[PDB]
Design a binder for this molecule. Structure first.
Ligand SMILES: CC(=O)N[C@H]1[C@H](O[C@H]2[C@@H](O)[C@@H](CO)O[C@H](O[C@@H]3[C@H](O)[C@@H](O)[C@H](O[C@H]4[C@H](O)[C@@H](O)[C@H](O)O[C@@H]4CO)O[C@@H]3CO)[C@@H]2O)O[C@H](CO)[C@H](O)[C@@H]1O
Length: 196
């Protein structure tokens, strides 16, 4: 059997880009913040609870799905580009609308730990793991009005936890499903367009 549960993080953060001109590509840093996660998706055909007497195997993969474009409040498109993905595995690069970053750091790990191996959507748990930052840069359209900007950029980040009854178990949430997961995180990108 295989049980996979996606635990979604949902913090809001700000990044000050300062004064910028439309010929520049201001950057912003997206950091992974340990916190409370909410199940937003699962797929299970195994047992619901492990009572401590039985073994199962863990495969954990961190995910970040980030938009390639975002509209400003006043109606202008900002183009998001990856500047430094750190150790993240940037995949499904052909998608026109979103970046997909994954970090599979645990696999084939046998455990007897008691717990709920298929929490339902809405359930929560605390994620204490830390992952690398991702630095993005933004291209501003030349026709962007001058002034202060506070751009809300929704995105998904979370932990895919896969429990299985056997060794060598592998599962990755399909990109097409991931792209649709609730985007509970928010980067609030601030900057003042002084021209150019
Ligand atoms: C679908 C698939 O399995 N392979 C694709 C691959 O998928 C892996 C990728 O998304 C990474 C990103 O971190 O996470 C998963 O794998 C983890 C580790 O990162 C990876 O190093 C490790 O590999 C070990 C393998 O499992 C062992 O059997 C082997 O003996 O030793 C290897 C190295 O130590 O595996 C884990 C698995 O959880 C994903 O599985 O991504 C690429 C890039 O897109 C491509 O699609 C592959 O087909």
């Amino acid at each position: 059997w295989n049980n996979i549960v996606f635990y979604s993080l949902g913090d809001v953060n700000s990044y000050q880009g300062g004064n910028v001109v439309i010929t520049q590509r201001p950057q912003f840093i997206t950091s992974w913040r340990p916190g409370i996660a909410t199940v937003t998706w699962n797929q299970c055909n195994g047992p619901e609870f492990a009572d401590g007497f039985w073994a199962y195997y863990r495969e954990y993969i961190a995910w970040v799905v980030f938009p390639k474009k975002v509209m400003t409040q006043n109606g202008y498109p900002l183009f998001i580009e990856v500047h430094n993905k750190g150790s993240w595995s940037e995949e499904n690069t052909g998608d026109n609308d979103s970046y997909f970053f994954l970090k599979g750091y645990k696999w084939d790990e046998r455990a007897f730990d008691a717990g709920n191996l298929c929490q339902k959507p809405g359930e929560i748990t605390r994620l204490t793991e830390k992952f690398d930052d991702i630095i993005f840069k933004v291209a501003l359209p030349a026709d962007l009005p001058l002034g202060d900007y506070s751009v809300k950029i929704p995105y998904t980040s979370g932990m895919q936890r896969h429990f299985a009854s056997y060794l060598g178990a592998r599962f990755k949430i399909p990109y097409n499903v991931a792209k649709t997961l609730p985007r509970e995180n928010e980067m609030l990108f601030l900057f003042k367009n002084i021209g150019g």
